[PDB]
Amino acid sequence: ALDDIDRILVRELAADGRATLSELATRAGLSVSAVQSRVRRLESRGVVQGYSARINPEAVGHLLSAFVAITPLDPSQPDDAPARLEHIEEVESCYSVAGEESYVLLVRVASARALEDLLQRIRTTANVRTRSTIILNTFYSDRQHIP
Amino acid sequence: ALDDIDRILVRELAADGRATLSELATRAGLSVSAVQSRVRRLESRGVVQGYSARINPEAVGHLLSAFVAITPLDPSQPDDAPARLEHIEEVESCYSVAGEESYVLLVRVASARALEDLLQRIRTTANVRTRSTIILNTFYSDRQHIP
Numbered sequence: 001a002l003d004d005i006d007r008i009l010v011r012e013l014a015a016d017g018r019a020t021l022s023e024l025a026t027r028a029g030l031s032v033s034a035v036q037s038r039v040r041r042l043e044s045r046g047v048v049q050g051y052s053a054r055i056n057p058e059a060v061g062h063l064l065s066a067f068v069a070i071t072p073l074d075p076s077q078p079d080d081a082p083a084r085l086e087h088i089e090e091v092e093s094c095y096s097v098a099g100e101e102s103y104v105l106l107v108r109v110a111s112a113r114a115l116e117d118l119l120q121r122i123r124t125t126a127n128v129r130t131r132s133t134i135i136l137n138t139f140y141s142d143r144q145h146i147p
Numbered sequence: 148a149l150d151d152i153d154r155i156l157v158r159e160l161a162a163d164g165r166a167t168l169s170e171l172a173t174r175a176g177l178s179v180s181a182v183q184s185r186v187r188r189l190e191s192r193g194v195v196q197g198y199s200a201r202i203n204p205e206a207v208g209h210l211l212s213a214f215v216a217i218t219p220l221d222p223s224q225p226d227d228a229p230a231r232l233e234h235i236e237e238v239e240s241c242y243s244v245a246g247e248e249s250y251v252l253l254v255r256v257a258s259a260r261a262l263e264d265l266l267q268r269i270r271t272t273a274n275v276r277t278r279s280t281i282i283l284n285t286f287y288s289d290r291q292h293i294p
């Protein structure tokens with residue numbers, strides 16, 4: 001249930017998550033109260049999940065990033081791997097995936113040696129084997145597309 | 148350097164892109180002017196790159212997401228696939244990687260049949276082979292860590 005106004009809003013907020021209400025209003029042709037109200041509804045259905053500064057991972061110390069695919073050492077009991085890895089701050093994303101492995105993580109770390117220590121924490125806390133793909137360079141990311 | 152006032156600043160902004168200059172400055176131990184100018188140098192030094200709302204992709208009609216691993220077919224040609232694909236909009240992310248493939252893409256798409264289309268386009272436009280891994284579920288996605 002996304003009408004055209006909602007599409008302009010989510011599209012403007014994808015590009016600028018700090019658009020103020022007056023800017024959005026005068027872009028959608030609405031009152032500032034109507035915008036507030038539409039935005040609130042977007043947030044409470046789960047259309048807008050939240051708002052974030054896009055931080056440069058190199059500037060804060062994360063010089064190495066990697067994809068880690070993980071697969072349960074014993075796939076019999078149901079899977080708590082996402083829940084159990086939620087406590088590891090260096091895991092930034094966690095997806096379940098079709099094919100041979102069961103999840104892919106994106107992980108960020110200070111160095112090669114910090115990566116090896118983190119792979120150990122991952123194997124032990126979710127009881128998983130790991131396959132690691134170091135990222136060499138990010139050309140662009142999160143380029144969110146509203147059709 | 149990142150003066151750890153700067154650290155409490157980027158942590159607060161990573162979890163809330165719409166925190167306001169006022170509510171920051173408090174939990175920061177500063178003034179709505181100090182806080183305010185700092186944040187402008189953070190965007191200047193490329194430490195915060197942007198602000199974005201986090202849009203749920205299913206809610207806007209991206210029912211299938213995928214990692215698409217790509218390798219150029221001819222190594223006598225310049226390897227420019229990131230630039231070559233930058234105009235295709237359903238490629239949300241592009242990374243060069245150290246593993247089997249040269250790059251990894253994250254792609255979002257309407258349906259299994261639209262993915263087939265998109266892959267064929269990726270292949271004919273960069274000049275690549277594709278190997279894709281279907282995302283079943285996002286448990287959490289860019290939860291940025293600041294040490």
Ligand SMILES: CC(C)C[C@H](N)C(=O)O
Pocket residue numbers: 096097098099100101102103283
């Ligand atoms: C989500 C996973 C436990 C499923 C498995 N990797 C498959 O492709 O069938």
